[PDB]
Amino acid sequence: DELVFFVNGKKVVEKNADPETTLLAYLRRKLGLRGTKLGCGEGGCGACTVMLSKYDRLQDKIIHFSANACLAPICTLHHVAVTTVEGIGSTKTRLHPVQERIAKSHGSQCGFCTPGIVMSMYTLLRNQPEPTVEEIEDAFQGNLCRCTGYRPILQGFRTFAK
Amino acid sequence: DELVFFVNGKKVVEKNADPETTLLAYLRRKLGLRGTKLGCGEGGCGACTVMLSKYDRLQDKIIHFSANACLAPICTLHHVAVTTVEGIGSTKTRLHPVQERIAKSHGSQCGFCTPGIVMSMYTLLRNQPEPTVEEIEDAFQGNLCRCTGYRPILQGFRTFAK
Amino acid sequence: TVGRPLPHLAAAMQASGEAVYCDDIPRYENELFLRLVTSTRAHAKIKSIDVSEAQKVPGFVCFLSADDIPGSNETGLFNDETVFAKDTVTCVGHIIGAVVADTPEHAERAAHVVKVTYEDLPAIITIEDAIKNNSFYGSELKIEKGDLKKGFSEADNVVSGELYIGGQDHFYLETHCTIAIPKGEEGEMELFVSTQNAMKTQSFVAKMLGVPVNRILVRVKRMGGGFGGKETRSTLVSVAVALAAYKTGHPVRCMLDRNEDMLITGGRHPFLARYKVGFMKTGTIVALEVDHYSNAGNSRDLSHSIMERALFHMDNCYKIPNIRGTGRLCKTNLSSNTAFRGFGGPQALFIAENWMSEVAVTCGLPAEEVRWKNMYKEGDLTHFNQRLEGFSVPRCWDECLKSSQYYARKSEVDKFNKENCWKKRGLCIIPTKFGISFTVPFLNQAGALIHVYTDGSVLVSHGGTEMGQGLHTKMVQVASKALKIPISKIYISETSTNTVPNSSPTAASVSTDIYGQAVYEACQTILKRLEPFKKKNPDGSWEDWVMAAYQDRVSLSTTGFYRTPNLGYSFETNSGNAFHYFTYGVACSEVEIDCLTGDHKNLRTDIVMDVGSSLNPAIDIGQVEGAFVQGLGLFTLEELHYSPEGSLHTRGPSTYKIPAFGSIPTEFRVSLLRDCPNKKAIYASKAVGEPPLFLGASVFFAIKDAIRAARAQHTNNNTKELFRLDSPATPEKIRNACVDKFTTLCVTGAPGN
Amino acid sequence: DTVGRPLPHLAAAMQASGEAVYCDDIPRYENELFLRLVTSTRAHAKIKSID
Amino acid sequence: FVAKMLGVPVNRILVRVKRMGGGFGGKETRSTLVSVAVALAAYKTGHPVR
Amino acid sequence: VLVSHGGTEMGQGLHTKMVQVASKALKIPISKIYISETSTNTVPNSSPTAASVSTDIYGQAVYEACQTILKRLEPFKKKNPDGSWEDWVMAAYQDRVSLST
Amino acid sequence: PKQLRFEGERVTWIQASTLKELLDLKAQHPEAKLVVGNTEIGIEMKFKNQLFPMIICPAWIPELNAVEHGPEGISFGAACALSSVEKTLLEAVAKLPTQKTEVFRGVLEQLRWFAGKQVKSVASLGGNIITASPISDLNPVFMASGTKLTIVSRGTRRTVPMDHTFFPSYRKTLLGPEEILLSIEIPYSREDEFFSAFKQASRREDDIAKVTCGMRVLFQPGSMQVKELALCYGGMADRTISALKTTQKQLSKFWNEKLLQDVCAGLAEELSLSPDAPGGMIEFRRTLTLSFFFKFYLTVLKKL
Numbered sequence A, B: 001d002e003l004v005f006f007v008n009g010k011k012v013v014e015k016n017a018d019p020e021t022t023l024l025a026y027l028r029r030k031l032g033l034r035g036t037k038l039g040c041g042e043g044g045c046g047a048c049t050v051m052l053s054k055y056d057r058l059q060d061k062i063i064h065f066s067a068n069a070c071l072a073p074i075c076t077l078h079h080v081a082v083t084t085v086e087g088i089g090s091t092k093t094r095l096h097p098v099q100e101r102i103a104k105s106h107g108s109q110c111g112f113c114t115p116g117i118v119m120s121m122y123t124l125l126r127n128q129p130e131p132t133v134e135e136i137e138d139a140f141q142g143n144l145c146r147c148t149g150y151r152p153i154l155q156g157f158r159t160f161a162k
Numbered sequence C: 001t002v003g004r005p006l007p008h009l010a011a012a013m014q015a016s017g018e019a020v021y022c023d024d025i026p027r028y029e030n031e032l033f034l035r036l037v038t039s040t041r042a043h044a045k046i047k048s049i050d051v052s053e054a055q056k057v058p059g060f061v062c063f064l065s066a067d068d069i070p071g072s073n074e075t076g077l078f079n080d081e082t083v084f085a086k087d088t089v090t091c092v093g094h095i096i097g098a099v100v101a102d103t104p105e106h107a108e109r110a111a112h113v114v115k116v117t118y119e120d121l122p123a124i125i126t127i128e129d130a131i132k133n134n135s136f137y138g139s140e141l142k143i144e145k146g147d148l149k150k151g152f153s154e155a156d157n158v159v160s161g162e163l164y165i166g167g168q169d170h171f172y173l174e175t176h177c178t179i180a181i182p183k184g185e186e187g188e189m190e191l192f193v194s195t196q197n198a199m200k201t202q203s204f205v206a207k208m209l210g211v212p213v214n215r216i217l218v219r220v221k222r223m224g225g226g227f228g229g230k231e232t233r234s235t236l237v238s239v240a241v242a243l244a245a246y247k248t249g250h251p252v253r254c255m256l257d258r259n260e261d262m263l264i265t266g267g268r269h270p271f272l273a274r275y276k277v278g279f280m281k282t283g284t285i286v287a288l289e290v291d292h293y294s295n296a297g298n299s300r301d302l303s304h305s306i307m308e309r310a311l312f313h314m315d316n317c318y319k320i321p322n323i324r325g326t327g328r329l330c331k332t333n334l335s336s337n338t339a340f341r342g343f344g345g346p347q348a349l350f351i352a353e354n355w356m357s358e359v360a361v362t363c364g365l366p367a368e369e370v371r372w373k374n375m376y377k378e379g380d381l382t383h384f385n386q387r388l389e390g391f392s393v394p395r396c397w398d399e400c401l402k403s404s405q406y407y408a409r410k411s412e413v414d415k416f417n418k419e420n421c422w423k424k425r426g427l428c429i430i431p432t433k434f435g436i437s438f439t440v441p442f443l444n445q446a447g448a449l450i451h452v453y454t455d456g457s458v459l460v461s462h463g464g465t466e467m468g469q470g471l472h473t474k475m476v477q478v479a480s481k482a483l484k485i486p487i488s489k490i491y492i493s494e495t496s497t498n499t500v501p502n503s504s505p506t507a508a509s510v511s512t513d514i515y516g517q518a519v520y521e522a523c524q525t526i527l528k529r530l531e532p533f534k535k536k537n538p539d540g541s542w543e544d545w546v547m548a549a550y551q552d553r554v555s556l557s558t559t560g561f562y563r564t565p566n567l568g569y570s571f572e573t574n575s576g577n578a579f580h581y582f583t584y585g586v587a588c589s590e591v592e593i594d595c596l597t598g599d600h601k602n603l604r605t606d607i608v609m610d611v612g613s614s615l616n617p618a619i620d621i622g623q624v625e626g627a628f629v630q631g632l633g634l635f636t637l638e639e640l641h642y643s644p645e646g647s648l649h650t651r652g653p654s655t656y657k658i659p660a661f662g663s664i665p666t667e668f669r670v671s672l673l674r675d676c677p678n679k680k681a682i683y684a685s686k687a688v689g690e691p692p693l694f695l696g697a698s699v700f701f702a703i704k705d706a707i708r709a710a711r712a713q714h715t716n717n718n719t720k721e722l723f724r725l726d727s728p729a730t731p732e733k734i735r736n737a738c739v740d741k742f743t744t745l746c747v748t749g750a751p752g753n
Numbered sequence D: 001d002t003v004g005r006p007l008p009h010l011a012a013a014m015q016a017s018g019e020a021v022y023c024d025d026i027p028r029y030e031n032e033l034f035l036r037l038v039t040s041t042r043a044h045a046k047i048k049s050i051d
Numbered sequence E: 001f002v003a004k005m006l007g008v009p010v011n012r013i014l015v016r017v018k019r020m021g022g023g024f025g026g027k028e029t030r031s032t033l034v035s036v037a038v039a040l041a042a043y044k045t046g047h048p049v050r
Numbered sequence F: 001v002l003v004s005h006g007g008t009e010m011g012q013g014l015h016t017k018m019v020q021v022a023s024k025a026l027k028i029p030i031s032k033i034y035i036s037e038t039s040t041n042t043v044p045n046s047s048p049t050a051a052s053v054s055t056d057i058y059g060q061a062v063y064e065a066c067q068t069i070l071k072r073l074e075p076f077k078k079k080n081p082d083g084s085w086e087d088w089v090m091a092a093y094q095d096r097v098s099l100s101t
Numbered sequence G: 001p002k003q004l005r006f007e008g009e010r011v012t013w014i015q016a017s018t019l020k021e022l023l024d025l026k027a028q029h030p031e032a033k034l035v036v037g038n039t040e041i042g043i044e045m046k047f048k049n050q051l052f053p054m055i056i057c058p059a060w061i062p063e064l065n066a067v068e069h070g071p072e073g074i075s076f077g078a079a080c081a082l083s084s085v086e087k088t089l090l091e092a093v094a095k096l097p098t099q100k101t102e103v104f105r106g107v108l109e110q111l112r113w114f115a116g117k118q119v120k121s122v123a124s125l126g127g128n129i130i131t132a133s134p135i136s137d138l139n140p141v142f143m144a145s146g147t148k149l150t151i152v153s154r155g156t157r158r159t160v161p162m163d164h165t166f167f168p169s170y171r172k173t174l175l176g177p178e179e180i181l182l183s184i185e186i187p188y189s190r191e192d193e194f195f196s197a198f199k200q201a202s203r204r205e206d207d208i209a210k211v212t213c214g215m216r217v218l219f220q221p222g223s224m225q226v227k228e229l230a231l232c233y234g235g236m237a238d239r240t241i242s243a244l245k246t247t248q249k250q251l252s253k254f255w256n257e258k259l260l261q262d263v264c265a266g267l268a269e270e271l272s273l274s275p276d277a278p279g280g281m282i283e284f285r286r287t288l289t290l291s292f293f294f295k296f297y298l299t300v301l302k303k304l
């Protein structure tokens, strides 16, 4: 059978899906979208954060949630739409405000954890356009940064509360 | 049907031969043996000179002749054995005397036409280990060199006569 | 823009995922993948290696071992390592070889399936085994000032004891990574590595291949973190991937998974310390004797220089008249430990703050009173006979006390502890100083290379690598000021061995200083050369001058160079400058512990750092914040745990806990000290990278304060007792020291109390 | 000191073996694309449309 | 010429030349008709191009 | 030794001739010297390789580069008259002298 | 929505669309590995080197995804994400009265400092339970609360409250080789019924030696007299265990100073560790078992 899912809005038809392929591997290495990073492969660092969207035949609504790409078998993603860091904005066209915020706040130093924190925050905003300081801070239990000490990121993102 | 030929002694099993594939394209781009060069694609420069070997069911013997690889369909090569410049020697192991000779004689300058002249001469020696000045000089009607003025090549190869 | 808070130049590309790290580089059509094969024994003889089943794995290309190497199998800083292990393995992650295959996946399957047959050998794992087996690299390092017998005779009280501080993994979000491209001519090779040390990557590859250094090109665009673990250890990947590239004639790459990296790459040196302090009832230190032991692991690497920086920092900010510090490097069957942000300072500084906290208890005085009494004055000499000029710690200290409202919050604390029974609070204020310069004098050198092109635009290149610290940003700020042109006209692409040769590793926190200087010189030369054309056309633009210089055949390219003046400490004699200057700081922290679970909140931290005149306040605050939270990680949270056989259990985020969003103090305030220019460095600034990490200890001791209080509540009644608390103070260690009706068996049996 | 002495071109042996790398001989990337110029068939003309 | 066509400062553009299989003047300037075209293709598609 | 200059190699043996000059200027074997390529990030603003003057002008640039290296190594040469090129080179690096110009 | 099938180098993956398909495939292939979020299987294949040549993904099946509010409590399909559990349960806590929500709040505590939005968004409930990690933070809760488990195979259907017999040996659960966990009903808290959940803050070995517990007391109507008492722990053996001897001994005893003394003597005896138990941390581990209970004891007294 054919595996059909979307990435950054674009249709992906995988005719020979291997059940062992993780979405991270698939983005980086078949699709060439290198924004999503490998940081540990065991679901603890968040560097591989993506947002997934599926229609839920139940809530009626389309849901959006965040996910670890290093653990997500592509085979679970039939009819699911992936959005990566490169799907929300770019210095070539326009940064998404989430991206510009972390950039101008000095919340990114080495930068390797940034795309996943961008995604962890971007997901929250998709589910709650006006979230609380409470909700912003807890949105990141699954992202680690070794560089910043976290204070600048939380401060930069706090501008999305009230 | 499968296409089966050999390159520098190694078996090549092409399961989906395209009739339009030239040997040159195949060596360079499927096999990544980049010592054979494109100079014209119309059989006039010799930059793409290889040696071919087939068993001839008639002479009894195996025959060795030279060929333009820009014009040879791989499809004519079933059960033919190709030898390229990387098949006869190398600075990594040992230069074949034909290579060492052209080098030490100042017969190579820019060097783009060298692989094919090496091949044109190498073929002559496979068919006549002790050729005459006459046969050496005529061996090269199909090789052009824009650099050397030919004199040093011929002088360097002359040491193969007598 | 110097002194203005300019965001990191790559930040927006980092935010978008356009910024290219090593593994993000596109693959060649024929590019291959390597996976290291690694020991599963601490100490053994390799009996055989069997590849049978790896060969059957789809896409397998070859297995590599020691026999495949064409040049030398002798590698390491001090030539004491193998590229591939031969007869014996000397630790659990010891590299034996490597599988090469067509996909990282196929590599992974193939490597996992290589059977090694071993023959176990006697094995030295702990510092304690190393001592008792007399197993060290080199002899004892020593600094001795004054006279001990007479310090100890004159002494009122003499506290002695033993301390341990655990190692640490770098946990750079990006693991080690190398792409090697073999060119096919003359042994040439081009390499893209995540490394702080492109000069050693180059040497090692060449030594291994048997080819001159001039054939080998090493490029480093950026790293996803270094913190020291890429000063040297990067070469365990680089050299292996190079060989693969040599053997197959194809491009080859490797990025390690986390678990490989934590096993193989080495981390911070654990220290054991045995100490003896002599003091007056006043709290004035009169003598101090400390023997240090580090756990080096199975090669020398940077261990010796680590113990030197430790010995230079065994005083913290304390004038100690009679002093003896020794250091021993334990030779053990564990991954070779290496550089980690602070490079032995943290460990020596923590040892120091440990006996100091005990002086103050033993004397029943408050800690701040005792710390202060013992503090260096402007112009005092260190135990290593270097003059302390511009000693700005008292300013840092007063200003920190004041804005941290330390005396008032101390009231709140003893208050909280009287009304709270199973929860307690602590508050501590700690100083630091940190020497700036590599301990080895020859590394304090730096080249830069500037081209100015004819459209007016500028390409800067220098020996330093970018790992998140914003080195390129700061360098671009200096060029732009030096040159008197907008930052927008300048650019740095990458670091490479073909632009700046023989560069020292990007380390020791002196990169802004030394590279800043080199770029400054480079700029200056360009300014001389343009002077005439500036005079001929005073109202013209930079572009006119530039164009007019080219038309007149004046070179628009130059090198730049810098040498740190006046360096050279001697361990015999005990004199000469070890450092160029010191960075200074003070932190105060408040924690609340739960005495029933050992858990804790960090409530508040206030930090005042002396950075001189920051080239970039944003970047420098960012350095203090980062350094501090890694120190907080080192002292309270991060714990590497090994089996009795020397096999690491802690091999990912799930069993190794580095600080998380919610770990950081609820109130996290950082200030840079105002109006304190530093004459000794580029534009009156100071190195900021490593010096703040140790301020994290401020949480260790606040927790120790909280534990003290819980013990006075529920155990004995010594206002003056000392219990041993090692580092890291994790939940376990914290709970156990809250000796109560629960930890003794309750029940109304009896024990302790 | 080899100045004045007939030293062979330093790359000759590699040129003789076909190890010497010219532009097109550089390996391709996995995603590498190929361009072919479209060119005029007229000496002087107004371009009216391209299809 | 690559920079001018792309509208980006010169310091963004790295040119490397190992060797040529002949020049004789034809690659003093005229080389750029290809170079500039291949560069654009690289710009427009974001892939390497030859 | 890694030599780089503005000239490009098209078969005329420019790199060969530059290597011969460097080796004579520096007083060391040709085997110790190499030219990899010509690039805009090593030598900027280069005139095209043309007009037959490349040996002349690049030769002279490499000569100058060499001279500066020779000044720099002079002290260590005097301190160690009987030592090898590799000793002078290493002794200069240990003493924090630039080996790039 | 039809069944899909994918084949690769070593594994076969069947994406089932119907509970019948699932139940049939498990009968035909009892060995088959079920995979919902992969957050456990993924680890096992990559780091522990397991190959399961045959995988079924039941993620699509309604039932397995359903959230039902019956009179006993709230039932969650075994495939619902921990984040749905958390969201459904947050609403229950905020809507219903305190006295009916002790267990839910227990579950929600374990759910607090547990993974991240990424893991919780794809990690299933059933997935956790069946994984049977000795340091699972949820099984101690389901156990102490007697959470009812609905387990199905082709033909058969049983419901059983989770108790100590449900985890027989390391990583094993009491499912037959054809059975799948269909759903999980987390119970409403009764009158005179109180609950707590605690966990060690940290973890140091892969799946051992992290103390975590669920605790439940039911009193005689309006009294302080114990009727049911359950103290379940992870992190003290190779599986979720229950302090059966200790709590049995306290039936119809009064909730006071004396009971505290007896329970702690009991807990130190019954959950005692040999000084070479896997995981180390012997002394700290003891201390958390008693200290956790003391918290429970103290908290119950306040709730009383």
Ligand SMILES: Cc1cc2nc3c(=O)[nH]c(=O)nc-3n(C[C@H](O)[C@H](O)[C@H](O)COP(=O)(O)OP(=O)(O)OC[C@H]3O[C@@H](n4cnc5c(N)ncnc54)[C@H](O)[C@@H]3O)c2cc1C
Pocket (backbone or CB within 6 Å): A042, A043, A044, C654, G033, G034, G035, G036, G037, G038, G039, G040, G041, G042, G078, G079, G113, G114, G115, G116, G119, G122, G123, G124, G125, G126, G127, G128, G129, G130, G131, G135, G136, G137, G138, G179, G180, G181, G182
């Ligand atoms: C970094 C991270 C942090 C974590 N932290 C914690 C933590 O703090 N506390 C904690 O308790 N856990 C923790 N976990 C584990 C997590 O809770 C479980 O991995 C998860 O619930 C498994 O669900 P899954 O959908 O991923 O199951 P899978 O990995 O897809 O499979 C789970 C197991 O159950 C079987 N199975 C699945 N569904 C059924 C079914 N319906 N019927 C019968 N068998 C079935 C599978 O065959 C397999 O054995 C963590 C995991 C990660 C990634």
Ligand SMILES: Nc1nc2c(c(=O)[nH]1)N[C@H]1C(S)=C(S)[C@@H](COP(=O)(O)O)O[C@H]1N2
Pocket (backbone or CB within 6 Å): A109, A110, A147, C224, C225, C226, C227, C228, C340, C341, C342, C467, C468, C469, C471, C506, C507, C508, C509, C510, C511, C512, C623, C626, C688, C689, C690
């Ligand atoms: N973001 C980030 N900051 C960092 C590091 C890192 O890897 N990432 N390494 C530290 C270490 S170990 C040192 S020595 C200095 C090195 O860079 P500098 O010399 O420019 O300060 O920065 C420190 N700050």
Ligand SMILES: Nc1nc2c(c(=O)[nH]1)N[C@H]1C(S)=C(S)[C@@H](COP(=O)(O)O)O[C@H]1N2
Pocket (backbone or CB within 6 Å): B109, B110, B147, B148, E022, E023, E024, E025, F010, F011, F012, F014, F049, F050, F051, F052, F053, F054, F055
């Ligand atoms: N073999 C060879 N010789 C050659 C060329 C060449 O392309 N190949 N170019 C010629 C031209 S046009 C010039 S201007 C000179 C330039 O190189 P030089 O300055 O080193 O002589 O090489 C000449 N000789």
Ligand SMILES: O=c1[nH]c(=O)c2nc[nH]c2[nH]1
Pocket (backbone or CB within 6 Å): C231, C302, C305, C309, C339, C343, C437, C438, C439, C440, C443, C507, C508, C509
């Ligand atoms: O020799 C060294 N001396 C140092 O001070 C240092 N710091 C990091 N790396 C270093 N190496």
Ligand code: MOM
Pocket (backbone or CB within 6 Å): C196, C226, C227, C228, C229, C231, C339, C340, C341, C342, C343, C506, C507, C508, C509, C690
């Ligand atoms: O000197 Mo920093 O690399 O530990």
Ligand code: MOM
Pocket (backbone or CB within 6 Å): E023, E024, E025, E026, E028, F049, F050, F051, F052
């Ligand atoms: O000067 Mo020759 O390149 O035309």
Ligand code: FES
Pocket (backbone or CB within 6 Å): A037, A038, A039, A040, A041, A042, A043, A044, A045, A046, A047, A048, A049, A068, A069, A070, A071
């Ligand atoms: S790589 Fe760390 S969670 Fe995916």
Ligand code: FES
Pocket (backbone or CB within 6 Å): A107, A108, A109, A110, A111, A112, A113, A114, A144, A145, A146, A147, A148, C173, C224, C225, C468
């Ligand atoms: S900035 Fe380096 S890890 Fe976050």
Ligand code: FES
Pocket (backbone or CB within 6 Å): B037, B038, B039, B040, B041, B042, B043, B044, B045, B046, B047, B048, B049, B068, B069, B070, B071
């Ligand atoms: S390329 Fe000129 S003859 Fe084939």
Ligand code: FES
Pocket (backbone or CB within 6 Å): B107, B108, B109, B110, B111, B112, B113, B114, B144, B145, B146, B147, B148, E021, E022, F011
């Ligand atoms: S060497 Fe240039 S064509 Fe013969």
